[PDB]
Design an enzyme around this catalytic site. Structure first.
Site, PDB file in Angstrom:
ATOM      1  N   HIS A  41      64.111  28.466  11.448  1.00 46.97           N
ATOM      2  CA  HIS A  41      63.381  27.702  10.426  1.00 46.97           C
ATOM      3  C   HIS A  41      62.071  27.088  10.966  1.00 46.97           C
ATOM      4  O   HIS A  41      61.312  26.560  10.165  1.00 46.97           O
ATOM      5  CB  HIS A  41      64.245  26.662   9.673  1.00 46.97           C
ATOM      6  CG  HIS A  41      64.719  25.496  10.486  1.00 46.97           C
ATOM      7  ND1 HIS A  41      63.858  24.500  10.885  1.00 46.97           N
ATOM      8  CD2 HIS A  41      65.983  25.147  10.832  1.00 46.97           C
ATOM      9  CE1 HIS A  41      64.606  23.608  11.526  1.00 46.97           C
ATOM     10  NE2 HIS A  41      65.895  23.954  11.517  1.00 46.97           N
ATOM     11  N   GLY A 143      63.045  16.330  13.744  1.00 44.59           N
ATOM     12  CA  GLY A 143      62.506  16.788  15.016  1.00 44.59           C
ATOM     13  C   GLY A 143      63.552  17.031  16.083  1.00 44.59           C
ATOM     14  O   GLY A 143      63.216  17.539  17.160  1.00 44.59           O
ATOM     15  N   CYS A 145      65.889  19.231  15.680  1.00 42.07           N
ATOM     16  CA  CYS A 145      66.320  20.639  15.586  1.00 42.07           C
ATOM     17  C   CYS A 145      66.055  21.398  16.864  1.00 42.07           C
ATOM     18  O   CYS A 145      65.059  21.139  17.537  1.00 42.07           O
ATOM     19  CB  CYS A 145      65.697  21.333  14.384  1.00 42.07           C
ATOM     20  SG  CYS A 145      65.979  20.467  12.827  1.00 42.07           S
TER      21      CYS A 145
END
Ligand SMILES: *CCC(=O)N(C(=O)[C@@H]1CCOc2ccc(Cl)cc21)c1cncc2ccccc12
Ligand SMILES: *CCC(=O)N(C(=O)[C@@H]1CCOc2ccc(Cl)cc21)c1cncc2ccccc12
Lengths: 301, 305
Positions: A41, A143, A145
């Protein structure tokens, strides 16, 4: 003595954390040898939130679109490919701090340490369990991820989780390091919800054995139970059913304490029926389910 | 979202852990520059722990008696000295992985991460607080002595604790990195007991602010209280008194949530006089006191190291 929720030392994983930026999105990447792994993503724009075609988006990207930064050094992306929900960025430099590692897919109930990161910088380490509904109850902000979950096998790091998303209830979902989600989740902004979470029964039993090893015996009783009667009661309290595999796994702790698994199951049934009555077990007023039988043996030995 | 007990990333400290052996005793050492720090009780064996004269024991030891091992490499001890309850072994090699560091002495209520080690090998990391009775509720086995407690600020490691002993109740005692014990403890095999522990009130308040930031608001009420009224009630429940310093430190969290400190104190007073009533806060049925106000800001804002 003492029993703490303990994470693995995170050093081997810190030396792999890098920052990956694609357009306006910045997240974390895991740099192992000459490959940086991160959630796919990172390539999503403002229109591909609901129904992204990642294969279509990735084909339109060039290596120069991916900014990879390891500390104060920019790494050069020389290739890119996708494996399920993980993006693999081939870089021109092998990470000299790459530890001995393997990628493992874990089952619900398994525990692991999470090295929470922001902008490729490690900020904290905590201990998690893969919930029966395949979510993790983490502590992640925007953030985070690309932060990873791991266990350490002597000198070997087993990477078992990569963080991708937060569900509406505040719980977290992610994939193994081959990009396969844990649970029925998709890396899309579509309406998604975790199933009702249940207690990891085998882990509660292991933690009751840890309590007995540490001197806490007040909840023990002279009863035993059949496995079927235990399961019937435990399922009414939203506890996972206990299989013969779970009984066998508790065998060493049963042998160490002199309390048969089904004897301990009758203590657990009583605890569910009465509550704690102002008492605590290992400093806790709730039954703890994020210690596996393996964690208990490791920490108590 | 989410709120976990989180330790600092331990990498900077793992690169300092070494094994120190003296006779039949093996424990952990902290290798910083050309010095290895470890508990001075490593020079004891059987009769030594009953009534130790550490100055007399150290004088008799030679450099070659101390076996220091960093991974698979043996370091050579070229000097030895004692600073309070810590032994300092001068080695011939500076640790190339020595991070930016300082030695700090912490106050009760302050939290830190512990890198638990065995035979100079890091095995786990956990977060804990220095209890008001100066013990820590750790998880340590035999061979864990010399394990260290630390915090990280920016890229600087502040070493605040070194593990020395386990008291009969299962709680732990140790020193700062200058060898001064936290609490009224001595490094001798003698009858010792920790004082009655109390709850770190300012930390419970910070954790209630963390719960509100995470959406848990059932315990909030319309009421406020005075510091005097709150302290009188809290001290009956073995809670530490809250000072104006603690109120000021909670200021940023009070501004972030719109719940004044004394407003949150009124919630806490009700939580003590009435209990949880079957409810939980951040998945806990007890009030958690091992998160400082700084820990809560750090975790709920994502400060990195
Ligand atoms: C990198 C952060 C991130 O993407 N988070 C999300 O959950 C995304 C928000 C929008 O919906 C969404 C759908 C699918 C996927 Cl795979 C990701 C997202 C995210 C992850 N952890 C914690 C977060 C806290 C706050 C905001 C976003 C978070
Ligand atoms: C390094 C282990 C150790 O020395 N432990 C002790 O607590 C010693 C046991 C004998 O009495 C004693 C008196 C003073 C001092 Cl400073 C140390 C000791 C130790 C430390 N942590 C955990 C332990 C668990 C089990 C046995 C010993 C432990």
């Amino acid at each position: 003595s003492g029993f703490r929720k303990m994470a693995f030392p995170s050093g081997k994983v810190e030396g792999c954390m890098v920052q990956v930026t694609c357009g306006t999105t910045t997240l974390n990447g895991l740099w192992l040898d000459d490959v940086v792994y991160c959630p796919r993503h990172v390539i999503c724009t403002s229109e591909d939130m609901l129904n992204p075609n990642y294969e279509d988006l990735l084909i339109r990207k060039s290596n120069h679109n991916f900014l990879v930064q390891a500390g104060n050094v920019q790494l050069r992306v020389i290739g890119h490919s996708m494996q399920n929900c993980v993006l693999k960025l081939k870089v021109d430099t092998a990470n000299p701090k790459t530890p001995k590692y393997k990628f493992v897919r874990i089952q619900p109930g398994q525990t692991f340490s999470v090295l929470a990161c922001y902008n490729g910088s490690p900020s904290g380490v905590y201990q998690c369990a893969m919930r029966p509904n395949f979510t993790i109850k983490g502590s992640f902000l925007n953030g985070s991820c690309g932060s990873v979950g791991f266990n350490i096998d002597y000198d070997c790091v087993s990477f078992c989780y990569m963080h991708h998303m937060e569900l509406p209830t505040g719980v977290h979902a992610g994939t193994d390091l081959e990009g396969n989600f844990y649970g029925p989740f998709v890396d899309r902004q579509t309406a998604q919800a975790a199933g009702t979470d249940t207690t990891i029964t085998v882990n509660v039993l292991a933690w009751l054995y840890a309590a007995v090893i540490n001197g806490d015996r007040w909840f023990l009783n002279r009863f035993t139970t059949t496995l079927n009667d235990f399961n019937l009661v435990a399922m009414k309290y939203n506890y996972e059913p206990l299989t013969q595999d779970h009984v066998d796994i508790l065998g060493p702790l049963s042998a160490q304490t002199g309390i048969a698994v089904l004897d301990m199951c009758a203590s657990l049934k009583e605890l569910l029926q009465n509550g704690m009555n102002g008492r605590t077990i290992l400093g806790s007023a709730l039954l703890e389910d994020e210690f596996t039988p393996f964690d208990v043996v490791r920490q108590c030995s």
